[PDB]
């Protein structure tokens, strides 16, 4: 097999001329020349079979991406693995090659208002499709938003996704761990398991803020610090919003804090489009029940140049609804079979 940086990267005769890109959540990522389609592609090596948790995440990533088909979602072009379950040790996922991600872009490039508008439109268009399938992404952040040379945007990494379950969302105080810290909604720390669509809208709001200034809006230094940053900008919650939190530990924590004032968005972002800030406020709303939903966000005046519900498709087949690693390996083998030989 071909080797890269001293490790096996076995993508067979179809894919050649490998180049190392870097390390992602799953391991090594390379580009390669697709000798069939005559174009360069991205390839991700996954090695999950020794651990049940890794197998769970890998099955989610593959099953969801194979069912979805949408312009603003990365999808999967091919999957490479051994012909037998016995010989299968690694799985390689082949995807369209992109130029960059939004994390890298924000480190060095100022975005025009037109680019912010276009990126936000594409994020929400993809998210409408995901939510219409009854699925929560649960880890939206700039590094999971990929861009090609013409600024087409693709949402990636569904390994942390779940089927929505609003009836079973309530839990206790300081127990939950959903999403990446800076993009994590306040209720995750208070009383929520992250099983409702509002979790994703919060993350998109955080991304919009970061596009406006090139800096994360709520840069918590650790898990417990994150709520300090959120409240330092939104200010103290209203009585009505507190009344929506029945859990006493969570409500009493908030009641114990000194008063904090809201910091006006236009003071944080004096060069921003006023319509962008109105939409930002609606996405970064403390009460998840009052927070704007994806279809409302698409219809906001900020996005009027792009909005067209007939060109914002939904999923044909929503997902309506303890396995050992051995059983999960079998499921991964079966899910990837369509790409043999
Ligand atoms: N250039 C590039 N990188 C990645 C990528 C994605 C995640 C991590 C790392 Br390191 C690289 C891609 N994923 C799909 N197409 C891709 N194109």
- HEC sequence for 12-34: CCCEEEEEEEEECCCCEEEEEEE
Strand order of the β-sheet with 153-155 is 100-101, 145-147, 153-155
Q: Is 169 a catalytic residue?
A: no
Phi-psi region of 174 (alpha: psi -120 to 50; beta: other; left: phi over 0): left
Task: For the beta carbon of residue 169, count every other beta carbon within 10 angstroms.
Answer: 17
If one residue of 15, 19, 21 were mutated to test the ligand 1 pocket, choosing by the most ligand atoms within 8 A of its CB, it would be 21
27 is in an annotated binding site: yes
The architecture in CATH of the region 1-97+322-341 reads 2-Layer Sandwich (3.30)
* 98-321 CATH fold: Transferase(Phosphotransferase); domain 1 (1.10.510)
Resolution (A): 1.5
Helix (H) or strand (E) run with residue 155 in it: strand 153-155
**Cα(171) to centroid(ligand 1), Å:** 35
**Cα(97) to centroid(ligand 1), Å:** 7
Q: What share of the chain is helix, strand, coil (3-state, %, to 5)?
A: 40, 15, 45
Rounded Cα distance between 72 and 170, Å, is 31
Query: Are the beta carbons of 29 and 43 closer than 8 angstroms?
Result: yes
24 is in an annotated binding site: yes
Rounded Cα distance between 286 and 197, Å, is 14
Experimental method: X-ray
DSSP helix/strand/coil, 96: strand
Pocket lining for ligand 1, CB < 6 angstroms: 21-24, 29, 42, 74, 95-98, 146, 156
| Residue range(s) of every CATH 3.30.200.20 domain in the chain | 1-97+322-341
């Amino acid at each position: 097999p071909e080797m890269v940086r001293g490790q096996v990267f076995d993508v067979g005769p179809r894919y050649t001329n490998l180049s190392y890109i870097g390390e992602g959540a799953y391991g090594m990522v390379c580009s390669a020349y697709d000798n069939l389609n005559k174009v360069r592609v991205a390839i991700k090596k996954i090695s999950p079979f020794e651990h049940q948790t890794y197998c769970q995440r890998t099955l989610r990533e593959i099953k969801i991406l194979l069912r979805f088909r949408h312009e603003n979602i990365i999808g999967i072009n091919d999957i490479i693995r051994a012909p037998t379950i016995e010989q299968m040790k690694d799985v390689y996922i082949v995807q369209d090659l992109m130029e960059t991600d939004l994390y890298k872009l924000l480190k060095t490039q100022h975005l025009s208002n037109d680019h912010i508008c276009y990126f936000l439109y594409q994020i929400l268009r993809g998210l409408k499709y995901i939510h219409s399938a009854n699925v929560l992404h649960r880890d939206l952040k700039p590094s999971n938003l990929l861009l090609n040379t013409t600024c087409d945007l693709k949402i990636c990494d569904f390994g942390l996704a779940r089927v929505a379950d609003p009836d079973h969302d309530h839990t206790g105080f300081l127990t939950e761990y959903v999403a990446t810290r800076w993009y994590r909604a306040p209720e995750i720390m208070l009383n929520s398991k992250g099983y409702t669509k509002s979790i994703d809208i919060w993350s998109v709001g955080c991304i919009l803020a970061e596009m406006l200034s090139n800096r994360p809006i709520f840069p918590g230094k650790h898990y417990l610090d994150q709520l300090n940053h959120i409240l330092g900008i939104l200010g103290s919650p209203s009585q009505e919003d507190l009344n929506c939190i029945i859990n006493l530990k969570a409500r009493n924590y908030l009641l114990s804090l000194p008063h904090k004032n809201k910091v006006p968005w236009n003071r944080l972002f004096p060069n921003a489009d006023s319509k962008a800030l109105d939409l930002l406020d609606k996405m970064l709303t403390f009460n998840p029940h009052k927070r704007i939903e994806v279809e409302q966000a698409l219809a906001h005046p900020y996005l009027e140049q792009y909005y067209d519900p007939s060109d914002e498709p939904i999923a044909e087949a929503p997902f309506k609804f303890d396995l050992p690693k051995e059983k999960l390996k079998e499921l991964i083998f079966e899910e990837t079979a369509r790409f043999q030989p």
